[PDB]
């Protein structure tokens, strides 16, 4: 698994791969690792599939109730606090959850990393999963807050591609969503990394690439 998100001048880019594994066997290549928490908050899934799915859907329910009760939109910080408290309550039980919560609210664009150990870290750039070190290195090497939407999407795609290239746990399709003031757009619904390799690393397609 490789998920990532970063702020830039037009909002937040969120990109993920789509592989699911059972041990070393590939259970699926079409799983959806970006979960809409509400109209303005997206969640990414890394780690246990059931844990991420269940607790992000549970957070969605909590936030729906909150926003009905108080007639206002929850903040990303509050959503992340709720999730981190819920997960910390299960410490030692063995939950495997790596989650990035990104969204827009009245305080602007926000991004938090929440893991099963209760960690809750505000930031502007995160990556989770087995492939996250590769995505980190690519992003840090080529990250500028003043990138336009096209550049930001291209960078996210390239980072996901390199992660899936080096990490056996990541692969399938790259999805790149864009979060903005009025919700989010799916710039790249799903693009097989197969084409990405023969587009970036070996466009000649005349012999096997050598690492």
């Amino acid at each position: 698994t490789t998920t990532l998100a970063f702020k830039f001048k037009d909002g937040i880019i969120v990109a993920v791969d789509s592989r699911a594994s059972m041990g070393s066997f590939i259970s699926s290549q079409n799983v959806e690792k970006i979960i809409e928490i509400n109209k303005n908050i997206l969640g990414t899934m890394a780690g246990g599939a059931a844990d991420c799915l269940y607790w992000e859907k549970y957070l969605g329910k909590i936030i729906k109730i909150y926003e009905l009760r108080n007639n206002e939109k929850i903040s990303v910080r509050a959503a992340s606090t709720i999730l981190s408290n819920i997960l910390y309550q299960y410490k030692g039980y063995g939950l495997c959850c790596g989650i990035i919560l990104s969204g827009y609210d009245h305080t602007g664009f926000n991004m938090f990393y929440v893991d099963d150990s209760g960690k809750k870290v505000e930031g502007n750039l995160f990556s989770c999963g087995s492939g996250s070190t590769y995505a980190y290195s690519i992003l840090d090497s080529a990250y500028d807050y003043n990138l336009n939407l096209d550049q930001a999407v291209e960078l996210a795609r390239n980072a996901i591609y390199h992660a899936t290239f080096r990490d056996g746990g990541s692969g399938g399709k790259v999805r790149v969503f864009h979060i903005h003031k009025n919700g989010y757009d799916k710039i790249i619904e799903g693009e097989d990394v197969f084409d990405l390799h023969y587009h970036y690393t070996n466009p000649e397609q005349k012999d096997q690439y050598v690492m």
């Binding site: 041990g23 070393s24 290239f165 990490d167 056996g168 990541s170 023969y198 096997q208």
Partner: protein
């Protein structure tokens, strides 16, 4: 068990009519999920009629290949002839068993031609091993490596008796690629060698790289 997951990889042998094919993935893993190489061939030529595919722990692959090359070269220089594929297969079994209690962590296959000298007839020859040298002589296909179950399914479903060289190539390549697409720790390229008594065709497949 996990030792075999350290590197990953797999090998596959198949026979047609007067032809035989051997294929492998090209990945060198490390720590079960890090790909460090994409040109690490598991296929080794002992002589023109004898190939061996060695999957498993890469250090043991290289070590066993060197031992086998030493033994084959000595045998052939002493005898002044090419080693018969069956003699080589039995020798490989004996070498693996000689380490019965501290074995090489390898999953070999042997693919080649058994020559029946009258004119000469070339009978495809296939054998799969376990790490202590138990042997499985077969006529259709052999598999080994962490991808063994997927290769077994693909071969049982798709193998076709008495295919010509092109049909053999398409079949073995499809079996290998489909099997690899379901493995997290194998793939990153495929080499396919199709053997005939007259020529060897070496192909690299445009495979998945994730």
């Amino acid at each position: 068990g996990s030792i075999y997951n350290y590197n990953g990889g797999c090998v596959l042998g198949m026979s047609g009519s007067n032809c035989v094919a051997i294929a492998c993935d090209l990945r060198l893993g490390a720590n079960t999920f890090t790909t460090v190489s994409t040109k690490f061939s598991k296929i080794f030529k002992m002589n023109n009629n004898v190939y061996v595919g060695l999957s498993g722990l890469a250090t043991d692959i290289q070590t066993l290949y060197e031992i086998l090359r030493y033994r084959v070269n000595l045998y052939e220089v002493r005898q002044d002839a090419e080693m018969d594929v069956e003699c080589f297969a039995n020798m490989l079994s004996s070498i693996l068993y000689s380490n019965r209690f501290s074995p090489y962590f390898v999953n070999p296959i042997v693919v080649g031609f058994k020559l029946k000298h009258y004119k000469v007839n070339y009978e495809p020859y296939l054998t799969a091993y376990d790490l202590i040298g138990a042997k499985c002589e077969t006529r259709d296909f052999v598999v080994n490596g962490v991808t063994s179950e997927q290769l077994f399914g693909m071969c049982e479903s798709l193998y076709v008796k008495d295919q010509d060289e092109n049909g053999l190539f398409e079949t073995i390549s499809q079996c290998l690629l489909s099997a690899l697409d379901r493995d997290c720790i194998s793939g990153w390229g495929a080499e396919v060698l199709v053997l005939t008594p007259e020529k060897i065709i070496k192909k690299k497949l445009k495979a998945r790289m994730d």
